[PDB]
Amino acid sequence: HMAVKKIAIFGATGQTGLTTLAQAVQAGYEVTVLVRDSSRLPSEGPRPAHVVVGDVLQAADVDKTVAGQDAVIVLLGTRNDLSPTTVMSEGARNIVAAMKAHGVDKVVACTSAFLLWDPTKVPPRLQAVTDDHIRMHKVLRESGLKYVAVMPPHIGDQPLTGAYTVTLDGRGPSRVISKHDLGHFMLRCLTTDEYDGHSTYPSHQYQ
Amino acid sequence: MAVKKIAIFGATGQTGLTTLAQAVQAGYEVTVLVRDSSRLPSEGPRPAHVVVGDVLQAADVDKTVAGQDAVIVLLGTRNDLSPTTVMSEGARNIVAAMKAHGVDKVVACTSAFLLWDPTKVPPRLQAVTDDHIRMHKVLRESGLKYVAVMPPHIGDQPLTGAYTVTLDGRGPSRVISKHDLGHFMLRCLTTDEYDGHSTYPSHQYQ
Ligand SMILES: NC(=O)c1ccc[n+]([C@@H]2O[C@H](COP(=O)([O-])OP(=O)(O)OC[C@H]3O[C@@H](n4cnc5c(N)ncnc54)[C@H](OP(=O)(O)O)[C@@H]3O)[C@@H](O)[C@H]2O)c1
Numbered sequence: 044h045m046a047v048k049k050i051a052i053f054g055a056t057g058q059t060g061l062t063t064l065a066q067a068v069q070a071g072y073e074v075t076v077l078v079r080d081s082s083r084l085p086s087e088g089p090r091p092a093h094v095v096v097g098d099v100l101q102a103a104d105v106d107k108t109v110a111g112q113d114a115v116i117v118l119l120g121t122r123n124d125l126s127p128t129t130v131m132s133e134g135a136r137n138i139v140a141a142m143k144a145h146g147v148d149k150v151v152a153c154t155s156a157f158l159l160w161d162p163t164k165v166p167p168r169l170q171a172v173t174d175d176h177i178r179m180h181k182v183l184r185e186s187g188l189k190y191v192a193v194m195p196p197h198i199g200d201q202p203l204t205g206a207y208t209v210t211l212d213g214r215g216p217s218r219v220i221s222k223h224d225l226g227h228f229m230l231r232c233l234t235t236d237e238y239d240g241h242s243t244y245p246s247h248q249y250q
Numbered sequence: 251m252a253v254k255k256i257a258i259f260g261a262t263g264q265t266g267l268t269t270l271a272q273a274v275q276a277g278y279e280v281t282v283l284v285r286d287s288s289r290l291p292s293e294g295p296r297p298a299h300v301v302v303g304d305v306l307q308a309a310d311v312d313k314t315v316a317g318q319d320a321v322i323v324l325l326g327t328r329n330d331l332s333p334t335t336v337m338s339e340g341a342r343n344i345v346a347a348m349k350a351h352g353v354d355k356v357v358a359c360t361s362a363f364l365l366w367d368p369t370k371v372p373p374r375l376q377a378v379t380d381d382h383i384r385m386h387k388v389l390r391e392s393g394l395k396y397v398a399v400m401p402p403h404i405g406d407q408p409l410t411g412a413y414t415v416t417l418d419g420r421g422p423s424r425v426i427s428k429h430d431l432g433h434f435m436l437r438c439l440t441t442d443e444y445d446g447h448s449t450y451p452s453h454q455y456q
């Protein structure tokens with residue numbers, strides 16, 4: 044019945060991206076992914092409708108990915124690399140410009156629950172990556188787009204439940220969210236305007 | 251000192267716009283150098299003088315620095331991904347103009363990266379950070395009374411006037427509102443105590 048039907052997913056080959064992609068395909072979305080390496084997509088796994096091979100640091104590649112979409116999901120990250128980086132904030136800059144040029148309004152983007160923390164209490168080893176989450180959140184907040192700021196705590200390997208808590212504009216009662224539940228939530232944000240302009244912290248107790 | 255007339259370079263950026271607004275509200279006679287005056291707000295506080303030009307033309311810079319009591323430098327080129335000298339070349343023009351016109355006080359903003367180990371700088375920001383360093387040395391070698399403002403993350407929180415200022419080192423917090431940052435650049439015009447120092451404004455925003 045397709046109010047939102049065509050979506051771009053950035054970071055679809057990552058931990059959360061892969062299950063977000065699987066869930067999106069099963070839910071009937073027509074998914075376009077931007078991937079650096081097509082081999083990162085599972086050969087047996089569910090196939091997106093459209094693959095763009097390129098880099099989020101090329102405006103041209105982002106433009107090709109955002110063209111014609113109804114909404115954008117952002118799950119960019121640096122895997123376990125804790126080095127100083129601007130890939131997420133610069134990627135978000137390109138995504139914002141592409142959305143504005145192509146008339147896409149809705150962006151659901153994952154940073155981190157550390158953006159709800161006292162900034163001085165972030166573990167030093169995570170500060171470089173958190174610094175770029177901060178830069179990225181500022182890019183998206185200042186864009187004027189309909190931006191849902193997803194700020195998860197630890198991403199785990201527990202099941203899909205669809206039963207997690209969503210805390211608005213503050214830290215939630217648990218310190219973990221499964222990658223499957225986080226992906227479920229990213230997609231849920233496509234079906235409602237209630238989180239637009241808010242920060243959201245999904246979390247759950249797996250039992 | 252008795253600072254009434256200031257030039258602002260970089261007035262159309264995010265920090266420059268609120269520094270300009272606050273300077274006009276406080277009563278400074280502000281001159282700005284802009285490439286396109288349509289980039290200045292049509293409403294609210296407006297500067298007293300507008301020079302149309304850019305910081306890479308020594309004549310435009312001389313026209314902007316002439317007659318001033320102090321200079322505020324809010325130049326940026328963080329669009330740049332690879333070696334660039336716009337900021338340091340601009341500071342060279344500004345220093346030459348201040349010397350020619352007898353202007354002694356410069357308050358310039360670079361980045362708190364200049365107070366961190368260089369391995370803290372993200373690779374795609376190293377070029378702009380390298381030119382921040384070059385601009386800082388151009389101003390440190392100046393012999394002019396130079397306050398180096400080296401802020402951390404610049405946020406959009408409302409003005410508080412309650413931030414802390416750390417001297418020659420990093421402070422406790424890691425963010426400064428663009429409004430508090432502009433407030434501090436203006437405060438540097440009212441005192442000698444920061445001259446020849448690096449300054450790190452920061453605050454925790456409830
Ligand atoms: N407990 C946690 O792990 C945790 C907690 C809170 C927040 N976070 C944050 O949550 C977000 C998602 O985490 P995650 O574990 O699901 O992600 P991830 O496994 O790190 O995957 C990151 C995705 O971004 C892609 N990517 C990186 N650079 C790219 C580039 N230049 N161009 C195009 N794509 C690029 C990656 O592609 P490749 O496959 O080519 O590498 C990958 O698909 C991250 O930002 C993370 O920092 C994680």
Ligand SMILES: NC(=O)c1ccc[n+]([C@@H]2O[C@H](COP(=O)([O-])OP(=O)(O)OC[C@H]3O[C@@H](n4cnc5c(N)ncnc54)[C@H](OP(=O)(O)O)[C@@H]3O)[C@@H](O)[C@H]2O)c1
Nearest residue numbers: 260261262263264265284285304305325326360361403404
């Ligand atoms: N973003 C951060 O979190 C952060 C943190 C620490 C430090 N800083 C640094 O603080 C400084 C200012 O902050 P910002 O973010 O507000 O900068 P910004 O938004 O990028 O503003 C750039 C300003 O620089 C002027 N400019 C650039 N090249 C010029 C040229 N040839 N001639 C004349 N003017 C020129 C521009 O004037 P015209 O447009 O009229 O040409 C413009 O007003 C920057 O250097 C930045 O790197 C930023």
Ligand SMILES: CC1(C)CCC(C)(C)c2cc(NC(=O)c3ccc(C(=O)O)cc3)ccc21
Nearest residue numbers: 123155156157169172195196197198214218
């Ligand atoms: C850089 C990266 C991807 C490396 C891997 C780990 C180390 C896994 C990681 C962990 C977090 N954050 C959290 O795990 C977390 C947990 C609870 C709260 C909270 O209680 O608010 C907040 C944040 C953020 C980024 C990262």
